[PDB]
CSV table of C-alpha atoms in Angstrom, one decimal:
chain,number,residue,atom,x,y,z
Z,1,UNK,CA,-57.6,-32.1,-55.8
Z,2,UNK,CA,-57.5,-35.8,-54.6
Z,3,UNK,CA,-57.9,-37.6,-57.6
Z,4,UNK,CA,-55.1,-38.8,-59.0
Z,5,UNK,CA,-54.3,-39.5,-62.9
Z,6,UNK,CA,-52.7,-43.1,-61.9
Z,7,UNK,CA,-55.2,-44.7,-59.7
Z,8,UNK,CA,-54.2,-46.2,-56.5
Z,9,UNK,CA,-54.4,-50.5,-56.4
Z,10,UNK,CA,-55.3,-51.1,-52.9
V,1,UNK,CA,-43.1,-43.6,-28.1
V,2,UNK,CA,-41.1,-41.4,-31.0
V,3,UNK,CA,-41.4,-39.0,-33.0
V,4,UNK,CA,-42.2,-41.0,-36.6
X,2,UNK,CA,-32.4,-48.2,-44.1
X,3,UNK,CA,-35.6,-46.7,-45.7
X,4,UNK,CA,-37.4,-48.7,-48.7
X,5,UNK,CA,-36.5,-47.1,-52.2
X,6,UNK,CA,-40.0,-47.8,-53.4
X,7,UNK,CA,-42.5,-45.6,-51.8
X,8,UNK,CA,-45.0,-47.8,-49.6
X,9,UNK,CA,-48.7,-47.8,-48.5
X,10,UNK,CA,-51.0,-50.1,-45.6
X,11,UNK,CA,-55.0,-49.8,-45.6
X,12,UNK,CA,-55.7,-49.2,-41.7
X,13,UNK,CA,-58.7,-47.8,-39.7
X,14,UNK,CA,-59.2,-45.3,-37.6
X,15,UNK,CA,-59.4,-45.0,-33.9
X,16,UNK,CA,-61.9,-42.8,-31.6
X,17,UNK,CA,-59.5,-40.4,-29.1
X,18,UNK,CA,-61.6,-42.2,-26.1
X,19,UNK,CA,-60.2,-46.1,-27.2
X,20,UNK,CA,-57.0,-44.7,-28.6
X,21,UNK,CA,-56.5,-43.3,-24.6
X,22,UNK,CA,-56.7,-47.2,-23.8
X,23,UNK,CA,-53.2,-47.7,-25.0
X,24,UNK,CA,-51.7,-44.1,-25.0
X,25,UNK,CA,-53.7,-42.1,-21.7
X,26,UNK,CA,-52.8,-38.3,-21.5
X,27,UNK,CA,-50.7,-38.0,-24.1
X,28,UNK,CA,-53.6,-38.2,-26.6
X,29,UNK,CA,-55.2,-34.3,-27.3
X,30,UNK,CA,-58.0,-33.4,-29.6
X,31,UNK,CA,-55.5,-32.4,-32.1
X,32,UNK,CA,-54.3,-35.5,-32.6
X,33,UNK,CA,-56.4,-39.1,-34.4
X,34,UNK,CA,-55.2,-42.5,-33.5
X,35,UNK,CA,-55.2,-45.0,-37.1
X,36,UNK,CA,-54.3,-48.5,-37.0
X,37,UNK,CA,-53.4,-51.1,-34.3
X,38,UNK,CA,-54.7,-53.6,-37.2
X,39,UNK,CA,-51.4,-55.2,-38.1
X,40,UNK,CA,-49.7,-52.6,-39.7
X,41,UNK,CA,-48.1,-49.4,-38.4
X,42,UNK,CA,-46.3,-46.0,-39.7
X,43,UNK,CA,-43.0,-45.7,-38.3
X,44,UNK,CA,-39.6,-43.8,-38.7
X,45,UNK,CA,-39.1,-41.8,-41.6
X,46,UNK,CA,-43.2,-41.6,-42.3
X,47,UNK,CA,-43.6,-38.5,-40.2
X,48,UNK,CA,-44.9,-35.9,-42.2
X,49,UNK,CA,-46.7,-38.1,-44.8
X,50,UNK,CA,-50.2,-38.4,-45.4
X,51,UNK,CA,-53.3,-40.1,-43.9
X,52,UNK,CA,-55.8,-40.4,-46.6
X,53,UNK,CA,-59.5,-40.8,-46.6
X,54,UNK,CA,-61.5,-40.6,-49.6
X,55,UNK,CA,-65.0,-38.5,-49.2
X,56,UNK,CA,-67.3,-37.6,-52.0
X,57,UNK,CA,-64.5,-39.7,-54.6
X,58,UNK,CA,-61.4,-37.6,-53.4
X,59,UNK,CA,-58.9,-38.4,-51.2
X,60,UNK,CA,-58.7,-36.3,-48.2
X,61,UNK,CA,-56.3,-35.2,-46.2
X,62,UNK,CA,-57.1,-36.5,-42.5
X,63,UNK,CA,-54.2,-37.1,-40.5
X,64,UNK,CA,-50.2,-35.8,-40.9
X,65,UNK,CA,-47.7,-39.0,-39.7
X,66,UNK,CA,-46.9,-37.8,-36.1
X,67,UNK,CA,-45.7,-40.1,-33.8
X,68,UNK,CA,-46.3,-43.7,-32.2
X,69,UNK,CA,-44.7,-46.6,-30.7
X,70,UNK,CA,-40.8,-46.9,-30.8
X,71,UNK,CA,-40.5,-50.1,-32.2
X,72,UNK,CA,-43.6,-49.8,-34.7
X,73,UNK,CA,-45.4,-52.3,-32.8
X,74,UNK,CA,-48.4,-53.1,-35.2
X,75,UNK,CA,-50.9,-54.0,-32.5
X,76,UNK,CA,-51.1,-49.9,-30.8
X,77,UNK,CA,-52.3,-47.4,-32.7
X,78,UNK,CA,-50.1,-44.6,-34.5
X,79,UNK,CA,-50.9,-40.9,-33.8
X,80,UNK,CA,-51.7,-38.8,-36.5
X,81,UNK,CA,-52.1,-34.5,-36.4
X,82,UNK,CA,-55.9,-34.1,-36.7
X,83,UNK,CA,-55.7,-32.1,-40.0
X,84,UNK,CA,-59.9,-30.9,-39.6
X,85,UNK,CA,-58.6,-29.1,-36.2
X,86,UNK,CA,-55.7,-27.4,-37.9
X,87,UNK,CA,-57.3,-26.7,-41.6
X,88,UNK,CA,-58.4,-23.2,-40.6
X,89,UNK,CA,-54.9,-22.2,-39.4
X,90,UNK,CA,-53.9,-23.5,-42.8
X,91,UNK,CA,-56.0,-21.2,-44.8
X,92,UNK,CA,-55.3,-18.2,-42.4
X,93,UNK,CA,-51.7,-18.8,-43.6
X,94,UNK,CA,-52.2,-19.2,-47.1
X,95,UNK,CA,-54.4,-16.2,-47.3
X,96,UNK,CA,-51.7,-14.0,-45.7
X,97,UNK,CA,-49.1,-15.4,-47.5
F,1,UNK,CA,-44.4,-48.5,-42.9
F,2,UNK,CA,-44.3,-52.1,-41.6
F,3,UNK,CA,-46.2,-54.8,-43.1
F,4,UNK,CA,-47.6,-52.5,-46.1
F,5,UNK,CA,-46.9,-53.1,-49.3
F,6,UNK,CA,-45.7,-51.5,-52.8
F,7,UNK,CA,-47.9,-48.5,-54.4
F,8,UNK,CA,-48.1,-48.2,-57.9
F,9,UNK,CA,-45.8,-45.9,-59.5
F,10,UNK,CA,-47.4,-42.1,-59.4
F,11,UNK,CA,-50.3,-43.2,-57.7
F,12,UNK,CA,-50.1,-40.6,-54.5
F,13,UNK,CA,-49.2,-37.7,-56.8
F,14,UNK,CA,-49.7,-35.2,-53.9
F,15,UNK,CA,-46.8,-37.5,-51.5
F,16,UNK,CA,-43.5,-35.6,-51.3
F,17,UNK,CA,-40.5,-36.4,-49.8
F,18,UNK,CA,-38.0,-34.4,-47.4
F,19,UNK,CA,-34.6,-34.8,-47.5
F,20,UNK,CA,-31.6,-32.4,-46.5
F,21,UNK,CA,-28.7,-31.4,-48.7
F,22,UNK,CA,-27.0,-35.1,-48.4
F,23,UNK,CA,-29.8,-36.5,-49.9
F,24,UNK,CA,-30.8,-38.5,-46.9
F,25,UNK,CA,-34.5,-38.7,-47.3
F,26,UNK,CA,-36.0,-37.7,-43.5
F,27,UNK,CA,-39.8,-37.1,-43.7
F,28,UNK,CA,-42.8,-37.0,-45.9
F,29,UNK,CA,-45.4,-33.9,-46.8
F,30,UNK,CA,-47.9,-33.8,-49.1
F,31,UNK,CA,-48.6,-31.4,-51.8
F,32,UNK,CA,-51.9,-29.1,-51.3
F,33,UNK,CA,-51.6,-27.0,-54.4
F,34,UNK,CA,-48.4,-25.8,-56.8
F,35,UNK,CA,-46.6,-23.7,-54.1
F,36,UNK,CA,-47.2,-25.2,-50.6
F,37,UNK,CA,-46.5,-28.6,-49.2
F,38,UNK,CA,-48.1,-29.6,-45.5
F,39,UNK,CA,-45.4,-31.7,-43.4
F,40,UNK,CA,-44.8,-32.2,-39.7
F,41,UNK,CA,-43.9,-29.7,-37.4
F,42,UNK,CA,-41.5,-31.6,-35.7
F,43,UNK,CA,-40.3,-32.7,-38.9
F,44,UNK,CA,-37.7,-29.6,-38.0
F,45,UNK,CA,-37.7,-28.3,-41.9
F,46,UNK,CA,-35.7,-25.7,-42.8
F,47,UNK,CA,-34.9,-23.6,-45.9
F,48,UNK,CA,-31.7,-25.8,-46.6
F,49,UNK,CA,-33.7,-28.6,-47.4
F,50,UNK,CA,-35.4,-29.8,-50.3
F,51,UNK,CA,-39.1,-31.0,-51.3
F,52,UNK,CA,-38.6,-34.1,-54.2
F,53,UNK,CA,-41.5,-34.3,-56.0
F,54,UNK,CA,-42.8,-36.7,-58.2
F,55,UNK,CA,-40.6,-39.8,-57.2
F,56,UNK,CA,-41.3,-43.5,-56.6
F,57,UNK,CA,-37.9,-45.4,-56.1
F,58,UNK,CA,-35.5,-43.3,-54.9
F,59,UNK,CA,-33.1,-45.7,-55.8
F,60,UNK,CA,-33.6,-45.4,-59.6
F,61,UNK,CA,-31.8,-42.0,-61.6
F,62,UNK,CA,-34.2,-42.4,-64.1
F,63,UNK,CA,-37.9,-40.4,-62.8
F,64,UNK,CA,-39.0,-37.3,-63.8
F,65,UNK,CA,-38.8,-36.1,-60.4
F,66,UNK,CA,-38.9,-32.6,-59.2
F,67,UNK,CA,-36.2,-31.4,-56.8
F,68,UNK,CA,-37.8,-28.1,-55.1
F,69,UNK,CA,-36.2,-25.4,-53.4
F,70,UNK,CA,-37.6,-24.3,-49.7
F,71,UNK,CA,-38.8,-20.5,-49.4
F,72,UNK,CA,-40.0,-20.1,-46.0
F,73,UNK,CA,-40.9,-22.3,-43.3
F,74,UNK,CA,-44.6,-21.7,-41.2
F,75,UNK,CA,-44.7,-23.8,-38.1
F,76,UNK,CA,-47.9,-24.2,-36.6
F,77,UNK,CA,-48.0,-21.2,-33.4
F,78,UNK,CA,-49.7,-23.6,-31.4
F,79,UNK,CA,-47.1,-26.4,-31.7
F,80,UNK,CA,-46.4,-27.8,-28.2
F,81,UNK,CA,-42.8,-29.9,-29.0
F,82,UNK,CA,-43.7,-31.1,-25.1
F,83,UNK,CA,-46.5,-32.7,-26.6
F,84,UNK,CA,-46.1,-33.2,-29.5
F,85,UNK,CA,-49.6,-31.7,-30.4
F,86,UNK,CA,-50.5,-29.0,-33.1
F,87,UNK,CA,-47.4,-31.2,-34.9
F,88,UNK,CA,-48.0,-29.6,-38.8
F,89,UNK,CA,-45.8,-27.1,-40.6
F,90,UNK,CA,-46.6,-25.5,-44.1
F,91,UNK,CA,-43.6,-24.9,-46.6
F,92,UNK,CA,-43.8,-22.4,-48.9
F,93,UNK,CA,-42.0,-23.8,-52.3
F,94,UNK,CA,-39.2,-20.7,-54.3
F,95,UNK,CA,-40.1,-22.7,-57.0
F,96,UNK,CA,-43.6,-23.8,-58.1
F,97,UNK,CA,-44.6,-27.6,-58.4
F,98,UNK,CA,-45.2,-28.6,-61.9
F,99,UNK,CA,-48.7,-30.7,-62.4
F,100,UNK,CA,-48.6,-33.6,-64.3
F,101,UNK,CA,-49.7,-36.9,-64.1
F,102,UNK,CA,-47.4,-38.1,-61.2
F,103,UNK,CA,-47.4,-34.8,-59.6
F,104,UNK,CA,-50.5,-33.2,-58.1
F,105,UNK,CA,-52.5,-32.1,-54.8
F,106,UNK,CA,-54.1,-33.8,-52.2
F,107,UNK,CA,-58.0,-32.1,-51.1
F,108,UNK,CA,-58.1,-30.8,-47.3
F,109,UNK,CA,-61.4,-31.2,-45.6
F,110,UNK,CA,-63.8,-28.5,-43.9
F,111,UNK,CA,-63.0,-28.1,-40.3
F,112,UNK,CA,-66.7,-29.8,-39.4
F,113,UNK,CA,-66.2,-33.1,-41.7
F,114,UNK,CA,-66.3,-36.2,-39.8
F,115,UNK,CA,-64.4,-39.3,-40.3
F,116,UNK,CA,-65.4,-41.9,-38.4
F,117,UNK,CA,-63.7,-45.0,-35.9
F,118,UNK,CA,-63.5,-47.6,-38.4
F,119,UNK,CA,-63.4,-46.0,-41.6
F,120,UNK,CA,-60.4,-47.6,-43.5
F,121,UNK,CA,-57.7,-45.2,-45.0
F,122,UNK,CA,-54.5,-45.6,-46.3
F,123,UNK,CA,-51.5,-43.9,-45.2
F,124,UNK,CA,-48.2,-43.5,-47.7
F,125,UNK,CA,-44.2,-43.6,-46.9
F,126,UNK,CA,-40.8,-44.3,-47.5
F,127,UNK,CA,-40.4,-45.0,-43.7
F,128,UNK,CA,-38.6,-48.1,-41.9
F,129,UNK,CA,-40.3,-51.3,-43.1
F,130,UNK,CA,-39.0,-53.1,-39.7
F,131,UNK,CA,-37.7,-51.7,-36.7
């Protein structure tokens, strides 16, 4: 869980 | 307030 | 009326005792306070996450609950507290 | 949200959205594994809605996106709709969630983690960007 394949841009 |  | 393309906002969260500054009673232990910090959830969020990441993974902390009526983005939103709710959560996933 | 900003596409795999059999998009949940999505109690979900999963402009006819059928609705026995506290429902999906790379499930914490004021998180939506 929480870690996704696309990673966030914050 | 709301309910969001 | 909502965005077509699915949004996010950085914000911080609250203790219960300064999120009582702006909301008094109506704050209870199973709820956290995020925000006040120039953006804010509003309608149509409700239900969505509040993420935190821990260890590297993002974590669910808060459900979208409820908040101002205009979205003010000065007062805190209200969030359900999901660490006072998780063991309901697995209780119903057990049995289910 | 007001004053965020645009995610990247797929980026929040576990964010879902709620929307009734119109196709008017109402609340968000998030996926915690293939067959249950957590949402809002007073959300007011029932099994004549639908869980769309996998979506990022819900303007576009083109995504992949997962349109999932409602089995039964779990609302928290402690909700207080006075109050508004206890405010989280679990949905139980007739049809399981494919995994993919846009499409996948968020972690829950222990009941004794602690997240303190001022740790910055991020919080995702397709609600109102002004009121």
């Amino acid at each position: 869980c929480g870690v996704p394949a696309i990673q966030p841009v914050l | 307030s709301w309910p969001w | 009326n909502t965005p077509d393309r699915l949004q996010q906002a950085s914000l911080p969260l609250l203790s219960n005792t300064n999120c009582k500054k702006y909301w008094g009673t109506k704050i209870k232990d199973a709820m956290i306070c995020a925000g006040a910090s120039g953006v804010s959830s509003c309608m149509g969020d409700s239900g969505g996450p509040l993420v935190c990441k821990k260890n590297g993974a993002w974590t669910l902390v808060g459900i979208v609950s409820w908040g101002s009526s205009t979205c003010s983005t000065s007062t805190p939103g209200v969030y359900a507290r999901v660490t006072a709710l998780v063991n309901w959560v697995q209780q119903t996933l057990a049995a289910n | 949200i007001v004053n965020g900003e645009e995610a990247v596409p797929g980026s929040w795999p576990w964010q879902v959205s709620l929307q009734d059999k119109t196709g008017f998009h109402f609340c968000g949940g998030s996926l915690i594994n293939e067959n249950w999505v957590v949402t809002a109690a007073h959300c007011g979900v029932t099994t004549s809605d639908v869980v769309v999963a996998g979506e990022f402009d819900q303007g576009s006819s083109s995504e992949k996106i997962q349109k999932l059928k409602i089995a039964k609705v779990f609302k928290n026995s402690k909700y207080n709709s006075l109050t508004i506290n206890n405010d989280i429902t679990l949905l139980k999906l007739s049809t399981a969630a494919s995994f993919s790379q846009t499409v996948s499930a968020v972690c829950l914490p222990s009941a004794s983690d602690d997240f303190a004021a001022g740790t910055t998180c991020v919080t995702t939506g397709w609600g109102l960007t002004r009121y």
